[PDB]
PDB file of all heavy atoms in Angstrom:
ATOM      1  N   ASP A  81      90.874  81.717  91.915  1.00  0.00           N
ATOM      2  CA  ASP A  81      91.318  81.840  93.310  1.00  0.00           C
ATOM      3  C   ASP A  81      90.488  80.953  94.222  1.00  0.00           C
ATOM      4  O   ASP A  81      90.687  80.948  95.436  1.00  0.00           O
ATOM      5  CB  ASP A  81      91.245  83.287  93.786  1.00  0.00           C
ATOM      6  CG  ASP A  81      89.925  83.590  94.492  1.00  0.00           C
ATOM      7  OD1 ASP A  81      89.594  82.944  95.497  1.00  0.00           O
ATOM      8  OD2 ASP A  81      89.191  84.494  94.063  1.00  0.00           O
ATOM      9  N   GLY A  82      89.565  80.208  93.645  1.00  0.00           N
ATOM     10  CA  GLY A  82      88.604  79.407  94.411  1.00  0.00           C
ATOM     11  C   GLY A  82      87.366  80.212  94.757  1.00  0.00           C
ATOM     12  O   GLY A  82      86.509  79.752  95.511  1.00  0.00           O
ATOM     13  N   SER A  83      87.246  81.414  94.215  1.00  0.00           N
ATOM     14  CA  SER A  83      86.202  82.336  94.683  1.00  0.00           C
ATOM     15  C   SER A  83      84.825  81.853  94.260  1.00  0.00           C
ATOM     16  O   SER A  83      84.666  81.258  93.198  1.00  0.00           O
ATOM     17  CB  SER A  83      86.447  83.744  94.205  1.00  0.00           C
ATOM     18  OG  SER A  83      86.271  84.676  95.276  1.00  0.00           O
ATOM     19  N   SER A  84      83.838  82.115  95.094  1.00  0.00           N
ATOM     20  CA  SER A  84      82.509  81.490  94.982  1.00  0.00           C
ATOM     21  C   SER A  84      81.421  82.540  95.153  1.00  0.00           C
ATOM     22  O   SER A  84      81.437  83.287  96.132  1.00  0.00           O
ATOM     23  CB  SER A  84      82.341  80.398  96.017  1.00  0.00           C
ATOM     24  OG  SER A  84      82.624  79.115  95.457  1.00  0.00           O
ATOM     25  N   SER A  85      80.469  82.618  94.238  1.00  0.00           N
ATOM     26  CA  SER A  85      79.381  83.595  94.426  1.00  0.00           C
ATOM     27  C   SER A  85      78.167  83.220  93.600  1.00  0.00           C
ATOM     28  O   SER A  85      78.288  82.567  92.565  1.00  0.00           O
ATOM     29  CB  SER A  85      79.846  84.992  94.098  1.00  0.00           C
ATOM     30  OG  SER A  85      78.829  85.950  94.405  1.00  0.00           O
ATOM     31  N   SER A  86      76.987  83.627  94.041  1.00  0.00           N
ATOM     32  CA  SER A  86      75.754  83.226  93.350  1.00  0.00           C
ATOM     33  C   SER A  86      74.559  84.008  93.862  1.00  0.00           C
ATOM     34  O   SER A  86      74.559  84.494  94.992  1.00  0.00           O
ATOM     35  CB  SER A  86      75.513  81.741  93.472  1.00  0.00           C
ATOM     36  OG  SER A  86      74.948  81.416  94.744  1.00  0.00           O
ATOM     37  N   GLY A  87      73.537  84.128  93.033  1.00  0.00           N
ATOM     38  CA  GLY A  87      72.225  84.628  93.467  1.00  0.00           C
ATOM     39  C   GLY A  87      71.302  84.840  92.280  1.00  0.00           C
ATOM     40  O   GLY A  87      71.427  84.165  91.259  1.00  0.00           O
ATOM     41  N   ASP A  88      70.368  85.767  92.411  1.00  0.00           N
ATOM     42  CA  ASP A  88      69.399  86.034  91.344  1.00  0.00           C
ATOM     43  C   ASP A  88      69.698  87.341  90.640  1.00  0.00           C
ATOM     44  O   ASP A  88      70.578  88.093  91.060  1.00  0.00           O
ATOM     45  CB  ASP A  88      67.969  86.018  91.859  1.00  0.00           C
ATOM     46  CG  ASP A  88      67.681  87.110  92.885  1.00  0.00           C
ATOM     47  OD1 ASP A  88      68.178  88.238  92.756  1.00  0.00           O
ATOM     48  OD2 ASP A  88      66.924  86.872  93.841  1.00  0.00           O
ATOM     49  N   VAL A  89      68.981  87.621  89.566  1.00  0.00           N
ATOM     50  CA  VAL A  89      69.430  88.618  88.585  1.00  0.00           C
ATOM     51  C   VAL A  89      68.385  89.708  88.407  1.00  0.00           C
ATOM     52  O   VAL A  89      67.188  89.429  88.422  1.00  0.00           O
ATOM     53  CB  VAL A  89      69.704  87.949  87.237  1.00  0.00           C
ATOM     54  CG1 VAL A  89      70.188  88.986  86.222  1.00  0.00           C
ATOM     55  CG2 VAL A  89      70.582  86.697  87.171  1.00  0.00           C
ATOM     56  N   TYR A  90      68.844  90.931  88.241  1.00  0.00           N
ATOM     57  CA  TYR A  90      67.983  92.075  87.911  1.00  0.00           C
ATOM     58  C   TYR A  90      68.461  92.746  86.627  1.00  0.00           C
ATOM     59  O   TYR A  90      69.597  92.542  86.208  1.00  0.00           O
ATOM     60  CB  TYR A  90      67.988  93.091  89.043  1.00  0.00           C
ATOM     61  CG  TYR A  90      67.260  92.570  90.280  1.00  0.00           C
ATOM     62  CD1 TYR A  90      67.898  91.709  91.164  1.00  0.00           C
ATOM     63  CD2 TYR A  90      65.950  92.973  90.522  1.00  0.00           C
ATOM     64  CE1 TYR A  90      67.224  91.247  92.291  1.00  0.00           C
ATOM     65  CE2 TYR A  90      65.277  92.512  91.648  1.00  0.00           C
ATOM     66  CZ  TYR A  90      65.915  91.648  92.533  1.00  0.00           C
ATOM     67  OH  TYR A  90      65.237  91.197  93.647  1.00  0.00           O
ATOM     68  N   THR A  91      67.601  93.547  86.027  1.00  0.00           N
ATOM     69  CA  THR A  91      68.002  94.425  84.917  1.00  0.00           C
ATOM     70  C   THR A  91      67.851  95.885  85.303  1.00  0.00           C
ATOM     71  O   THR A  91      66.768  96.317  85.698  1.00  0.00           O
ATOM     72  CB  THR A  91      67.172  94.116  83.684  1.00  0.00           C
ATOM     73  OG1 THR A  91      67.836  93.143  82.873  1.00  0.00           O
ATOM     74  CG2 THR A  91      66.974  95.361  82.874  1.00  0.00           C
ATOM     75  N   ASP A  92      68.923  96.647  85.187  1.00  0.00           N
ATOM     76  CA  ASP A  92      68.940  98.049  85.628  1.00  0.00           C
ATOM     77  C   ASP A  92      69.850  98.882  84.740  1.00  0.00           C
ATOM     78  O   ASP A  92      70.633  98.338  83.964  1.00  0.00           O
ATOM     79  CB  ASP A  92      69.408  98.159  87.080  1.00  0.00           C
ATOM     80  CG  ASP A  92      68.764  99.363  87.769  1.00  0.00           C
ATOM     81  OD1 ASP A  92      68.333 100.308  87.091  1.00  0.00           O
ATOM     82  OD2 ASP A  92      68.669  99.388  89.005  1.00  0.00           O
ATOM     83  N   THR A  93      69.736 100.192  84.853  1.00  0.00           N
ATOM     84  CA  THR A  93      70.602 101.134  84.128  1.00  0.00           C
ATOM     85  C   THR A  93      71.945 101.270  84.827  1.00  0.00           C
ATOM     86  O   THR A  93      71.994 101.586  86.015  1.00  0.00           O
ATOM     87  CB  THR A  93      69.925 102.493  84.039  1.00  0.00           C
ATOM     88  OG1 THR A  93      68.822 102.435  83.131  1.00  0.00           O
ATOM     89  CG2 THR A  93      70.902 103.516  83.546  1.00  0.00           C
ATOM     90  N   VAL A  94      73.027 101.037  84.108  1.00  0.00           N
ATOM     91  CA  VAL A  94      74.367 101.096  84.709  1.00  0.00           C
ATOM     92  C   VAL A  94      75.248 102.091  83.972  1.00  0.00           C
ATOM     93  O   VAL A  94      75.308 102.083  82.744  1.00  0.00           O
ATOM     94  CB  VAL A  94      75.021  99.715  84.686  1.00  0.00           C
ATOM     95  CG1 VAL A  94      76.545  99.850  84.741  1.00  0.00           C
ATOM     96  CG2 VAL A  94      74.554  98.632  85.662  1.00  0.00           C
ATOM     97  N   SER A  95      75.917 102.943  84.723  1.00  0.00           N
ATOM     98  CA  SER A  95      76.747 104.020  84.160  1.00  0.00           C
ATOM     99  C   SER A  95      78.196 103.852  84.590  1.00  0.00           C
ATOM    100  O   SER A  95      78.462 103.622  85.770  1.00  0.00           O
ATOM    101  CB  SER A  95      76.230 105.377  84.589  1.00  0.00           C
ATOM    102  OG  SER A  95      75.762 106.120  83.463  1.00  0.00           O
ATOM    103  N   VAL A  96      79.127 103.971  83.661  1.00  0.00           N
ATOM    104  CA  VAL A  96      80.551 104.004  84.031  1.00  0.00           C
ATOM    105  C   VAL A  96      81.236 105.221  83.438  1.00  0.00           C
ATOM    106  O   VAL A  96      81.446 105.294  82.228  1.00  0.00           O
ATOM    107  CB  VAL A  96      81.253 102.733  83.554  1.00  0.00           C
ATOM    108  CG1 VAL A  96      82.750 102.812  83.864  1.00  0.00           C
ATOM    109  CG2 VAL A  96      80.704 101.360  83.954  1.00  0.00           C
ATOM    110  N   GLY A  97      81.585 106.173  84.284  1.00  0.00           N
ATOM    111  CA  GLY A  97      82.276 107.390  83.832  1.00  0.00           C
ATOM    112  C   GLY A  97      81.434 108.129  82.805  1.00  0.00           C
ATOM    113  O   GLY A  97      81.966 108.858  81.970  1.00  0.00           O
ATOM    114  N   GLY A  98      80.128 107.948  82.869  1.00  0.00           N
ATOM    115  CA  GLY A  98      79.200 108.735  82.045  1.00  0.00           C
ATOM    116  C   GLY A  98      78.852 108.004  80.762  1.00  0.00           C
ATOM    117  O   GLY A  98      78.168 108.555  79.898  1.00  0.00           O
ATOM    118  N   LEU A  99      79.297 106.767  80.622  1.00  0.00           N
ATOM    119  CA  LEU A  99      78.712 105.874  79.611  1.00  0.00           C
ATOM    120  C   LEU A  99      77.561 105.060  80.199  1.00  0.00           C
ATOM    121  O   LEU A  99      77.791 104.138  80.978  1.00  0.00           O
ATOM    122  CB  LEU A  99      79.759 104.941  79.033  1.00  0.00           C
ATOM    123  CG  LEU A  99      79.138 103.972  78.039  1.00  0.00           C
ATOM    124  CD1 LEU A  99      78.964 104.612  76.673  1.00  0.00           C
ATOM    125  CD2 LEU A  99      79.857 102.637  77.941  1.00  0.00           C
ATOM    126  N   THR A 100      76.345 105.414  79.828  1.00  0.00           N
ATOM    127  CA  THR A 100      75.140 104.757  80.350  1.00  0.00           C
ATOM    128  C   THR A 100      74.770 103.555  79.499  1.00  0.00           C
ATOM    129  O   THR A 100      74.674 103.654  78.277  1.00  0.00           O
ATOM    130  CB  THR A 100      73.981 105.740  80.387  1.00  0.00           C
ATOM    131  OG1 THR A 100      74.275 106.822  81.273  1.00  0.00           O
ATOM    132  CG2 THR A 100      72.744 105.043  80.875  1.00  0.00           C
ATOM    133  N   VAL A 101      74.549 102.420  80.141  1.00  0.00           N
ATOM    134  CA  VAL A 101      73.965 101.269  79.440  1.00  0.00           C
ATOM    135  C   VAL A 101      72.679 100.822  80.105  1.00  0.00           C
ATOM    136  O   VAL A 101      72.658 100.490  81.288  1.00  0.00           O
ATOM    137  CB  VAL A 101      74.961 100.113  79.390  1.00  0.00           C
ATOM    138  CG1 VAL A 101      74.276  98.844  78.877  1.00  0.00           C
ATOM    139  CG2 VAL A 101      76.309 100.300  78.685  1.00  0.00           C
ATOM    140  N   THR A 102      71.601 100.832  79.342  1.00  0.00           N
ATOM    141  CA  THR A 102      70.263 100.538  79.874  1.00  0.00           C
ATOM    142  C   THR A 102      69.947  99.058  79.729  1.00  0.00           C
ATOM    143  O   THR A 102      70.359  98.433  78.753  1.00  0.00           O
ATOM    144  CB  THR A 102      69.220 101.366  79.143  1.00  0.00           C
ATOM    145  OG1 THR A 102      69.598 102.745  79.141  1.00  0.00           O
ATOM    146  CG2 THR A 102      67.893 101.236  79.831  1.00  0.00           C
ATOM    147  N   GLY A 103      69.226  98.505  80.685  1.00  0.00           N
ATOM    148  CA  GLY A 103      68.849  97.084  80.649  1.00  0.00           C
ATOM    149  C   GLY A 103      70.069  96.192  80.777  1.00  0.00           C
ATOM    150  O   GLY A 103      70.149  95.152  80.123  1.00  0.00           O
ATOM    151  N   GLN A 104      71.016  96.573  81.615  1.00  0.00           N
ATOM    152  CA  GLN A 104      72.174  95.708  81.893  1.00  0.00           C
ATOM    153  C   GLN A 104      71.830  94.668  82.944  1.00  0.00           C
ATOM    154  O   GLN A 104      71.192  94.986  83.948  1.00  0.00           O
ATOM    155  CB  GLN A 104      73.371  96.537  82.364  1.00  0.00           C
ATOM    156  CG  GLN A 104      74.399  95.652  83.073  1.00  0.00           C
ATOM    157  CD  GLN A 104      75.255  94.889  82.060  1.00  0.00           C
ATOM    158  OE1 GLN A 104      75.790  93.716  82.386  1.00  0.00           O
ATOM    159  NE2 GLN A 104      75.461  95.396  80.848  1.00  0.00           N
ATOM    160  N   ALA A 105      72.241  93.434  82.718  1.00  0.00           N
ATOM    161  CA  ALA A 105      72.087  92.380  83.731  1.00  0.00           C
ATOM    162  C   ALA A 105      72.937  92.684  84.953  1.00  0.00           C
ATOM    163  O   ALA A 105      74.162  92.740  84.868  1.00  0.00           O
ATOM    164  CB  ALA A 105      72.472  91.032  83.148  1.00  0.00           C
ATOM    165  N   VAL A 106      72.285  92.890  86.083  1.00  0.00           N
ATOM    166  CA  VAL A 106      72.996  93.140  87.344  1.00  0.00           C
ATOM    167  C   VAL A 106      72.734  92.029  88.343  1.00  0.00           C
ATOM    168  O   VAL A 106      71.649  91.923  88.909  1.00  0.00           O
ATOM    169  CB  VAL A 106      72.579  94.484  87.938  1.00  0.00           C
ATOM    170  CG1 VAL A 106      73.177  94.650  89.338  1.00  0.00           C
ATOM    171  CG2 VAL A 106      72.780  95.770  87.130  1.00  0.00           C
ATOM    172  N   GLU A 107      73.740  91.197  88.546  1.00  0.00           N
ATOM    173  CA  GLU A 107      73.527  89.881  89.164  1.00  0.00           C
ATOM    174  C   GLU A 107      73.689  89.963  90.670  1.00  0.00           C
ATOM    175  O   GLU A 107      74.799  90.000  91.193  1.00  0.00           O
ATOM    176  CB  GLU A 107      74.485  88.864  88.576  1.00  0.00           C
ATOM    177  CG  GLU A 107      74.378  88.922  87.056  1.00  0.00           C
ATOM    178  CD  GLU A 107      75.438  88.034  86.429  1.00  0.00           C
ATOM    179  OE1 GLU A 107      75.916  87.100  87.088  1.00  0.00           O
ATOM    180  OE2 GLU A 107      75.812  88.250  85.268  1.00  0.00           O
ATOM    181  N   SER A 108      72.556  90.016  91.347  1.00  0.00           N
ATOM    182  CA  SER A 108      72.507  90.322  92.784  1.00  0.00           C
ATOM    183  C   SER A 108      72.830  89.081  93.600  1.00  0.00           C
ATOM    184  O   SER A 108      72.185  88.047  93.438  1.00  0.00           O
ATOM    185  CB  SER A 108      71.161  90.881  93.177  1.00  0.00           C
ATOM    186  OG  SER A 108      70.764  90.408  94.464  1.00  0.00           O
ATOM    187  N   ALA A 109      73.825  89.179  94.463  1.00  0.00           N
ATOM    188  CA  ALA A 109      74.293  88.006  95.216  1.00  0.00           C
ATOM    189  C   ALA A 109      73.373  87.719  96.390  1.00  0.00           C
ATOM    190  O   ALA A 109      73.032  88.621  97.153  1.00  0.00           O
ATOM    191  CB  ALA A 109      75.713  88.233  95.705  1.00  0.00           C
ATOM    192  N   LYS A 110      72.958  86.472  96.527  1.00  0.00           N
ATOM    193  CA  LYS A 110      72.404  85.980  97.798  1.00  0.00           C
ATOM    194  C   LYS A 110      73.501  85.351  98.645  1.00  0.00           C
ATOM    195  O   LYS A 110      73.422  85.362  99.872  1.00  0.00           O
ATOM    196  CB  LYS A 110      71.312  84.958  97.524  1.00  0.00           C
ATOM    197  CG  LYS A 110      70.012  85.666  97.177  1.00  0.00           C
ATOM    198  CD  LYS A 110      69.198  84.816  96.214  1.00  0.00           C
ATOM    199  CE  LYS A 110      68.049  84.148  96.954  1.00  0.00           C
ATOM    200  NZ  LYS A 110      68.028  82.708  96.653  1.00  0.00           N
ATOM    201  N   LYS A 111      74.510  84.818  97.986  1.00  0.00           N
ATOM    202  CA  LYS A 111      75.566  84.039  98.652  1.00  0.00           C
ATOM    203  C   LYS A 111      76.939  84.499  98.183  1.00  0.00           C
ATOM    204  O   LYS A 111      77.166  84.636  96.982  1.00  0.00           O
ATOM    205  CB  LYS A 111      75.387  82.560  98.342  1.00  0.00           C
ATOM    206  CG  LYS A 111      75.278  81.767  99.634  1.00  0.00           C
ATOM    207  CD  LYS A 111      75.312  80.278  99.328  1.00  0.00           C
ATOM    208  CE  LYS A 111      76.025  79.536 100.446  1.00  0.00           C
ATOM    209  NZ  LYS A 111      77.337  79.061  99.982  1.00  0.00           N
ATOM    210  N   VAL A 112      77.846  84.745  99.114  1.00  0.00           N
ATOM    211  CA  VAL A 112      79.228  85.061  98.747  1.00  0.00           C
ATOM    212  C   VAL A 112      80.220  84.311  99.625  1.00  0.00           C
ATOM    213  O   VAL A 112      79.906  83.942 100.752  1.00  0.00           O
ATOM    214  CB  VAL A 112      79.493  86.558  98.833  1.00  0.00           C
ATOM    215  CG1 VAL A 112      78.747  87.313  97.736  1.00  0.00           C
ATOM    216  CG2 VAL A 112      79.399  87.295 100.167  1.00  0.00           C
ATOM    217  N   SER A 113      81.399  84.123  99.077  1.00  0.00           N
ATOM    218  CA  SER A 113      82.522  83.382  99.650  1.00  0.00           C
ATOM    219  C   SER A 113      83.214  84.194 100.738  1.00  0.00           C
ATOM    220  O   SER A 113      83.057  85.412 100.790  1.00  0.00           O
ATOM    221  CB  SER A 113      83.527  83.003  98.578  1.00  0.00           C
ATOM    222  OG  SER A 113      83.855  81.615  98.657  1.00  0.00           O
ATOM    223  N   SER A 114      83.974  83.520 101.574  1.00  0.00           N
ATOM    224  CA  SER A 114      84.864  84.083 102.589  1.00  0.00           C
ATOM    225  C   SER A 114      85.737  85.187 102.008  1.00  0.00           C
ATOM    226  O   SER A 114      85.875  86.249 102.609  1.00  0.00           O
ATOM    227  CB  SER A 114      85.734  83.011 103.212  1.00  0.00           C
ATOM    228  OG  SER A 114      84.963  81.845 103.514  1.00  0.00           O
ATOM    229  N   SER A 115      86.298  84.926 100.845  1.00  0.00           N
ATOM    230  CA  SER A 115      87.206  85.839 100.141  1.00  0.00           C
ATOM    231  C   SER A 115      86.561  87.204  99.948  1.00  0.00           C
ATOM    232  O   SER A 115      87.123  88.222 100.345  1.00  0.00           O
ATOM    233  CB  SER A 115      87.624  85.267  98.805  1.00  0.00           C
ATOM    234  OG  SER A 115      88.449  86.191  98.091  1.00  0.00           O
TER     235      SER A 115
END
């Protein structure tokens, strides 16, 4: 769609509907597109 995003990365525990995944790359945006 032309979408644009970027920044630096963290590792954290992420849960979806009670499925926990530890040490998941969570990519924190410094910059995001208009969209």
Side-chain angles (χ1 to χ4, degrees):
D81 94 59
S83 226
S84 263
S85 186
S86 80
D88 63 38
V89 181
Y90 290 81
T91 268
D92 210 338
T93 289
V94 156
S95 245
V96 176
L99 177 82
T100 298
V101 170
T102 309
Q104 162 79 208
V106 172
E107 308 173 23
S108 143
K110 280 149 104 230
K111 236 189 146 251
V112 291
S113 230
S114 316
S115 177

